[PDB]
């Protein structure tokens, strides 16, 4: 009973990101009797061809992108979606999505911007990262004028949020005598850069007659919807300037309920000034939060949406089944992870059926004996599980 359809031993990761000097190689391995042949394709289901010095298919089936020149860059190659297909006589199955992105060595700079504060009011200096280079660039550490710096590596005064921003506990004219620059790390080449300018604190002495933020003439409230992976640290921003120091109360909405509740403050969950930090996010943390700002004059609130993503996975049951002619045949897709955008089924590398979690065949015919796959797509990643339908 060694005869069986193909199954993926190793699927490449959903994200392959590399540089032009680095080059890259993608491995795809499958089993089953006879050993299936490995083949690379695109979204439309056509086999990818070789390209000189750019895209190679090695003897043992693999996708090789050699290191190339910035001029040799071709989008339809270097920014593309690929999929691995394994097949033998019994049937064929397609891998999950593989997003290949070859970054090049670019020029970018960051700058720390100055922020206005008031005595007694905390604040945050940020690091401007160009939006285009911001995906592969995050701040390694902040710095102080004489150069002794602060990593995640003591008196809580300066807190570094997981967002890579410097927090300052309360404030005082003593604080504005310092300047800071943020250093950043490229997660591809590992190259580092100091920010173009040292950020500074301008501290305003108040008198009276001021309420937090809002607007009287115009403008808006910013609803910031943000997502953080499971097991990752979140951040929720409630920066404001008021008179005198106000109260910050974090709240949360439950699943469409307009009734706002209290946020439990744990050793894992800290309200800091008005800024909330969560460690090790999970699906339950997903929801919209609220920050109530009131001093004696009243106020207005920061609305924030949180969505915790978890890595996608798929399992089909039964993994293999043999049913006679005329009977029903049923497949059940069992998946985990968030968010789940679309669900779909495939047959020998062909789209079939609806988006339903359960694929059913009323009367199984002889032509139905190929491989069946279940695909769960997401805004970011995807995944799938194979299966085999034999006959009797």
Ligand X SMILES: *[C@@H]1O[C@H](CO)[C@@H](O)[C@H](O)[C@H]1NC(C)=O
Ligand Y SMILES: *[C@@H]1O[C@H](CO)[C@@H](O[C@@H]2O[C@H](CO)[C@@H](O[C@@H]3O[C@H](CO)[C@@H](O)[C@H](O[C@H]4O[C@H](CO)[C@@H](O)[C@H](O)[C@@H]4O)[C@@H]3O)[C@H](O)[C@H]2NC(C)=O)[C@H](O)[C@H]1NC(C)=O
The H or E element that residue 76 is part of is helix 75-78
User: Minimum CB separation from ligand X for residue 219, in Å?
Assistant: 16
70 binds ligand Y (CB under 6 A): yes
Q: Which does 21 bind (CB under 5 to 8 A by kind): a copy of itself, ligand Y, ligand X, none?
A: ligand Y
Q: How far is 345 from 331, CA to CA, in rounded Å?
A: 10
Q: Which is nearer to a copy of itself, 152 or 222 (CB)?
A: 222
* DSSP code for 136: T
* DSSP code for 78: H
End-to-end distance of the chain based on CA atoms, in angstroms?
15
74 binds ligand Y (CB under 6 A): no
Residue with tokens 């009131």: 294
Q: Which does 118 bind (CB under 5 to 8 A by kind): ligand X, a copy of itself, ligand Y, none?
A: a copy of itself
SS3 294: strand
Between 267 and 296, how does the x/- string for binding to ligand X read (CB under 6 A)?
A: -------------------------x-x--
Other beta carbons within 10 angstroms of residue 6's beta carbon come to: 25
Extract the tokens encoding 232: 């990752």
Q: Which is nearer to ligand X, 12 or 299 (CB)?
A: 299
Q: How far is 101 from 82, CA to CA, in rounded Å?
A: 11
Q: Choose one: 57-65, 70-78, 233-241, 297-305; the region binding ligand X (CB under 6 A).
A: 297-305
Which of 55, 22, 177, 36 shows the shortest CA–CA distance to 94?
36
Q: How far is 137 from 110, CA to CA, in rounded Å?
A: 10
Between 74 and 93, how does the x/- string for binding to ligand X read (CB under 6 A)?
A: --------------------
Q: Choose one: 42-50, 65-73, 126-134, 273-281; the region binding ligand Y (CB under 6 A).
A: 65-73
Q: Which does 69 bind (CB under 5 to 8 A by kind): ligand Y, ligand X, a copy of itself, none?
A: ligand Y
Provide CB contacts within 8 A for 24, sequence distance 6+.
Answer: 16, 18, 64, 65, 100, 102
Of 105, 192, 261, 322, which lies in the binding site for ligand Y, with binding defined by CB under 6 A?
A: 105
204 binds ligand Y (CB under 6 A): no
- Residues 301-340 touching ligand X, rule: CB under 6 A, are 301
192 binds ligand Y (CB under 6 A): no
Residues that bind ligand X (CB under 6 A): 292, 294, 298-301
């Amino acid at each position: 009973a060694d005869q069986k359809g193909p199954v993926f031993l190793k699927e490449p990761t959903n994200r392959i990101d590399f540089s032009n000097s680095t080059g890259a190689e993608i491995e795809c391995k499958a089993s089953g009797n006879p050993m299936p042949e490995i083949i690379w394709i695109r979204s439309d289901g056509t086999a990818v061809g070789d390209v000189p010095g750019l895209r190679q298919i090695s003897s043992d089936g693999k996708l090789v992108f050699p290191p190339f020149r910035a001029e040799d860059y071709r989008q339809e190659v270097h920014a593309q979606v690929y999929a691995c297909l394994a097949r033998n006589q019994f049937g064929s199955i397609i891998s999950r999505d593989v997003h290949v992105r070859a970054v090049v060595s670019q020029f970018y700079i960051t700058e720390a911007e100055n922020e206005y504060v008031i005595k007694g009011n905390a604040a945050v200096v940020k690091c401007k990262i160009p939006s285009f280079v911001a995906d592969f660039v995050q701040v390694e550490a902040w710095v102080d004028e004489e150069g002794m710096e602060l990593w995640r590596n003591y008196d809580g005064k300066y807190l570094v949020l997981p967002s890579g921003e410097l927090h300052i506990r309360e404030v005082g004219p003593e604080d504005g005598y310092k300047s800071y620059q943020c250093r950043t790390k490229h997660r591809l080449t590992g190259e580092t850069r100091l920010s173009a300018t040292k950020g500074r604190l301008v501290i305003t002495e108040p008198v009276g007659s001021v309420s937090p933020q809002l607007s009287g003439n115009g403008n808006q409230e910013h609803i910031t919807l943000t997502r953080v992976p499971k097991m990752g640290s979140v951040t929720l921003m409630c920066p404001a300037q008021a008179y005198p120091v106000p109260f910050f109360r974090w709240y949360k909405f439950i699943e469409g309920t307009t009734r706002k509740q209290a946020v439990v403050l744990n050793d894992r969950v800290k309200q800091v000034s008005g800024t909330l930090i969560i460690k090790d996010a999970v699906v339950e943390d997903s929801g919209k939060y609220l920050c109530v700002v009131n001093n004696s004059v009243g106020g207005e609130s920061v609305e924030t949406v949180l969505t915790v993503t978890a890595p996608l996975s798929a399992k089909i049951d039964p993994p293999t089944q043999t049913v006679d002619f005329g009977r029903p045949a049923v497949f059940t897709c069992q998946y985990t992870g968030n968010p789940i955008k679309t669900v779909s089924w495939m047959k020998d590398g062909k789209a079939i059926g609806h988006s339903e979690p359960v694929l059913r065949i009323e009367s199984v015919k002889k032509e139905d004996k190929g491989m069946y796959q279940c695909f769960v797509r997401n805004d970011q990643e995807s995944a799938e599980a194979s299966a085999e339908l034999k006959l009797g």
